[PDB]
Write a protein that binds this ligand. Sequence first.
Ligand SMILES: [Mg+2]
Ligand SMILES: [Zn+2]
Ligand SMILES: [Zn+2]
Ligand SMILES: [Zn+2]
Lengths: 51, 404, 98, 82, 378, 67, 263, 49, 115, 46, 52
Amino acid sequence: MGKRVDFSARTVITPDPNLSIDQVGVPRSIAANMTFAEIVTPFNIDRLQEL
Amino acid sequence: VIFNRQPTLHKMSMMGHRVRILPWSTFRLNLSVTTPYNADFDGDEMNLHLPQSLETRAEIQELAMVPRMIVTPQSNRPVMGIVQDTLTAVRKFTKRDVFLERGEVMNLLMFLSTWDGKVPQPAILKPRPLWTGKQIFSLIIPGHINCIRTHSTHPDDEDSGPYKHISPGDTKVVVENGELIMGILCKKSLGTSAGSLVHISYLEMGHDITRLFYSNIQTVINNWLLIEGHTIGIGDSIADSKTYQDIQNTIKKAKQDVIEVIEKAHNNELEPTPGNTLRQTFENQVNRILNDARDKTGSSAQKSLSEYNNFKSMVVSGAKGSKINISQVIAVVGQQNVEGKRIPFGFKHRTLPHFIKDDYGPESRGFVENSYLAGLTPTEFFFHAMGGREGLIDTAVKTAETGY
Amino acid sequence: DGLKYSLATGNWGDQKKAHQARAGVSQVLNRLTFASTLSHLRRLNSPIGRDGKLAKPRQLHNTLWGMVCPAETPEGHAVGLVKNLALMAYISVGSQPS
Amino acid sequence: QANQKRITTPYMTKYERARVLGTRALQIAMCAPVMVELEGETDPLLIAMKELKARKIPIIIRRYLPDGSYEDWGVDELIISD
Amino acid sequence: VYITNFHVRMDTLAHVLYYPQKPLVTTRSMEYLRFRELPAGINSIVAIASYTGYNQEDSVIMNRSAVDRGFFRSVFYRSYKEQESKGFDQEEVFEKPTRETCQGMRHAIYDKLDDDGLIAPGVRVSGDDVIIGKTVTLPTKRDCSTFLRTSETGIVDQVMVTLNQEGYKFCKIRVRSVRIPQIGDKFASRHGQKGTCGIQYRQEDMPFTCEGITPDIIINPHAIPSRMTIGHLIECLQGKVSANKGEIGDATPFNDAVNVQKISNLLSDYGYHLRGNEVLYNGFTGRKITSQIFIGPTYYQRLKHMVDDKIHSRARGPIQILNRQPMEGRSRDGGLRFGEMERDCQIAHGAAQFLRERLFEASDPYQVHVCNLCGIMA
Amino acid sequence: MIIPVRCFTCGKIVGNKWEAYLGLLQAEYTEGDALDALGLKRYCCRRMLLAHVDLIEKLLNYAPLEK
Amino acid sequence: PYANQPTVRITELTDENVKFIIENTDLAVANSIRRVFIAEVPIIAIDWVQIDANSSVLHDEFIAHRLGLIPLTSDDIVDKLQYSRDCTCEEFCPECSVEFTLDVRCNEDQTRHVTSRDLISNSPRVIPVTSRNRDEQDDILIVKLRKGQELRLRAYAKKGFGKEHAKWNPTAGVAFEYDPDNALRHTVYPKPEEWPKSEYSELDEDESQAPYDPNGKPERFYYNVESCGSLRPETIVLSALSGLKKKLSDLQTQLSHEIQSDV
Amino acid sequence: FIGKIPIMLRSTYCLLNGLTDRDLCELNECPLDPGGYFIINGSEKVLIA
Amino acid sequence: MNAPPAFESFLLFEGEKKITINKDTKVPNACLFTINKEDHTLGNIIKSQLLKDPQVLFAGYKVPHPLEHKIIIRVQTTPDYSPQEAFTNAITDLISELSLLEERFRVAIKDKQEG
Amino acid sequence: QPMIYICGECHTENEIKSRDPIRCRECGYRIMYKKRTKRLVVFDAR
Amino acid sequence: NELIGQTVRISQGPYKGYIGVVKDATESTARVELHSTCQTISVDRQRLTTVG
RNA sequence: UAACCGGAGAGGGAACCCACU
Ligand SMILES: [Mg+2]
Ligand SMILES: [Zn+2]
Ligand SMILES: [Zn+2]
Ligand SMILES: [Zn+2]
């Protein structure tokens, strides 16, 4: 019913008035660890190649 | 990403968000979104899940994204409102005697996202150009929205008598054709109640527009509050010393009225209320004197405060505190209760060893005739600790039943 | 080894009745701040079971004047059960009635 | 059921509106042919939203009625809410 | 400073502060607790104002230049014990593992070790670095070397080598790491008014008095009226009076020889407003603030709940043994729990494919073969 | 531990003041006379000396690690 | 549409501080000069510390922290140095840095106070603020040593400004004030009788604040700039004005390049 | 011989009984340390009442 | 470890521009100037100097985020006149103000020294 | 290779070989501290 | 690789003068742990210089 | 009428105590 998961982080929240309600601030160290898998297409192949 | 604080009780505890990357090592979220999450920024932690498939990415973007989650189906209100500083400075901003110079107006207009680049004609053109805070808030409000609300300090007789549509106190908020005509905006206009201005914005206009309507209020009001400023201090809690004497006379007359009830009880001159025993009707009469005393001192305190007060600046705006907290800081803490009754005889027919046995007086059973500004006597301090302990227990006990 | 086991683990009794014996006696001394050390060295414990909905032992009683600190208690599920010790409060040590 | 007997709503639900976009942008990510002359965008989810507004998505939706039967609704055949 | 001999004391999880100060406003019972010999906190200058909005919901704004000058800077000592021994021939031994000789060896640098198998003090270390090189012989050899805890990233303070009560060689290594206050670090007062840092501005960006006094700390006024901590305000008043007089303030509870009016009449003599309010100017525009700001010395504390001991993420890290779900813990590189209430919230959204992505694909995707006639796995 | 070099708020140097301050306290001087004898006018600088506890003296009572 | 002409008069000049008045300028210009006083005046402080021995009870980074806050007399050397991130040299040259050395060992039974006097500079002009105090005062304590303890270190001093770190902040207190009698009423006193008068006020005791004028703007800015001891307080101001002018000139050059490269 | 009993610091049979502060600093002990605890496998233990 | 380094407030990265110009499409004769690695120190005096020009109809600045180091200045001038030349005239007047102020300050310093 | 250690009690530097019982040749004390390393330490003054 | 494990000095750029140790290396760039701060950075090899 | 190098997912659990929202 409930279990551990991959691709998740946890840290302390702190205020920021200067960004919208649908935005969220993340540290670079968390973002440099959690990954998202994009499928290559001829649109993004150059960007993914540089990446 | 999806993003939650861990005691998830309703479906606004897991809401989608867009990622923005920032230098330091904490999660940062906007201050309205604190209200569904029940966040506190006092050492809270929140955990973030990243959706891995592109299909579930689209699913979160179309179902659980946060501006889509503004109005709940629990109680057909919005969940999010203006809070904690933007609300107080909104109330101070949209008052009738608020005037802005041309540089201040352009600095504030620099923080609107939904601005056409067109500067409105000021409310005063000569001797010198002056805009009004309502006139800028009319630029914040999107589309053509129409609503009518009332301010917290709106007097009841005013609608009955004359000056109904021209209010002397600048209450009765009226927004008409997307433009603030009149009124002062509090909790009852920008908060999370039904028929509030944000709710009309969500129903008449889309969720995407209401998102910008949140962010525009927060930016421009937090950038006006650098000019206005807002504090609290020890001067905010002090009184006239005409008020102090009135409070002391109220306490003295109530405390004498307790003693005469005790004398009528000892001389068997007290007849029991029907449906009650002699003990319960004695208790009822004593608590009636003490509660009427606390209310009268509280009302005297509330009448004493000035317009420039910073306790009143929050309670009128509804941002933080209540009308009993000001009375409990300035005038009288009150009676301390344990399980609805007074402080029980933990010793043999008395409470502490500093009291005579069979002392049903106010000071012997938990009433605190001192304020928080005046400090407490040690008996009253121990009784107030005994009062706070009960609620501190009930907080810990309540959770393991409510979650089950 | 019996004295050393019972003080090292906290199971207060024989090693065979490890689940029967009460635990939480002989905690590791908190050495974070000197005030934390003093408060951990002066601490009482109520061996009525936790997570019970009975508020009455957890309450602040009138016999706590001058002997136990009314303010100080952990805010968690042990409100009123763990209670620290007032300043001039002294605990008797026992003597013969003869 | 037959095209005469369509008793469900002519409106696309929020759940269908989510899942059609997800399963179309996944196809576009796997080099399916776009049904819309795009304006230079490369995000497949924006392309799927553009095809949904353009009413050109080549998917139909099978709504299972609780008796056991179903209805097949074209995405072109029903009203997009947003 | 939790004890005076903290440098001899090899102890896990030690925190000591650079510059502790005794409080300007004290009660007469701190003399007997010896608090003014081992204090925990600094007399800050707080200002209770809504400055930018980074202090709003119980948070706090800090002076970056004061933090640069050493304000609440602390240092964290972590110590590691290790004990060689256990079999008939399976001898543990401290040495440098060699890639030709020893079997299993991490990518980490082992050149930081001395040839005893230990590091000398004064060496910078980081996450996934050896500290104690220990090998057991293989019936060639396999290591049991201990690593520095991931994300700890400190410098070795001292290394002690000795013998246990079993006559075996025994080592304890203590590692410094200084901790500068950053945003997210949890601070508090002496009045139950806690809070995490939300932003740090420099001295230029911070508001200022008629003099160049800028507050080290800014807190929100909306933490006062519901909490009703009026002792915080009286402390902030008595601290200004005591710092101008030269006296240490007296805040014993039931004194009755001191109240707010006497403190106000004292403060009126030193050239201030009698209620503690002052006229601060905006640090950005220079315009003076329309409200007058309540400001003064208040004794704040630094709690042990940093953010760098709590932040952790995961993307397909290690896996449990019995069931093939992720681990638990910041130290074991564990995963968060998508528990029974969170699946329930995702049911209530009606997002079943995200629910399946959480509970099946992100935890343990797996396949079996089952007979088509009887449903037992083949 | 030891006296800080600069005031945290002001940035004025306070690190050279401490031994002079202890010298002035070993006289008829009160604290309120000794601080402005040293020229500390702002209370941000006055709290640096007035609230300091000098634990380096207690640390020097222990034998060192070497000789 | 043009610039205004400000005037200056000094009311106090001291080795410790300067007190002066600026007329006929804007609040923004006045604040930015107040702000470049704090952040963007280049000064010399030590930034590179190598410790060869530390047998004391204060650990290494505590000592390097206390060494960085020690100010260094850089009145004219800081104008002719270069930032070490900009100089062509490898690790350090005398055109980009200044070398300091500290080798102190305690041998007597008396506690050895290591002070800022025990720093030995490479250049005689760049030294700490034990320079001239004649017409008895102590020097900046670094560490106290027991018999048998010692420390040896070598350090280098760079040019920087206080936007990086507060050790490059040349000032102690920058008092700033405009409109001492509340004539513009940028602030609003609820009970104006309770407020003490300023130092620059011109009122009798009868009156508590000036009468409101709608036409007025902020002028007559009163500054008091207190130095730490590294720069003279009179040459903090000139260097801040030159730095702000140089910054504006560089910004105008970049904008000129953008405009003529856009057309 | 019966055994060995773990023993409380700063007690009447601890080795730190009645020592002066200088002698405690000679033994690398803290004079402000109150005692009242046991040292068992090099770990302080405190009997909660 | 997520601490950004102290030099990042004022040092341009490689490939960054100190200044960027973008025309504002909503209204005529308006433009947005984005400055990298500057703060209120420069934007406030630029805004105040622009507001002395009667041919400037709108002028303002903002920082989009304090942790970011960027500043945006929006200028709108009357037709016959450009926001770009308004900006560079404000700079070349503000430099003249600072130069005059520096000269008069050093003269008053010399006059304070025995005069 | 010599690996000089320092006696905790008598502060005597002494060379002990690898795989040897820990003991100081004078006063017989059994706690050694190692020594400070030789490689460079460089710190910012921040 | 040769550079891994070697104490190095950044000799160009804003990080000039910071001593560190090389954790990882490529021909284009390398990863250096800073001795002063608790942060690991990526720097080009042109800026690096081997010391000791 | 020439020129030497090469190996990689580790790693456990139970119990108790303290603490955080
Ligand atoms: Mg909270
Ligand atoms: Zn100061
Ligand atoms: Zn150079
Ligand atoms: Zn020895």
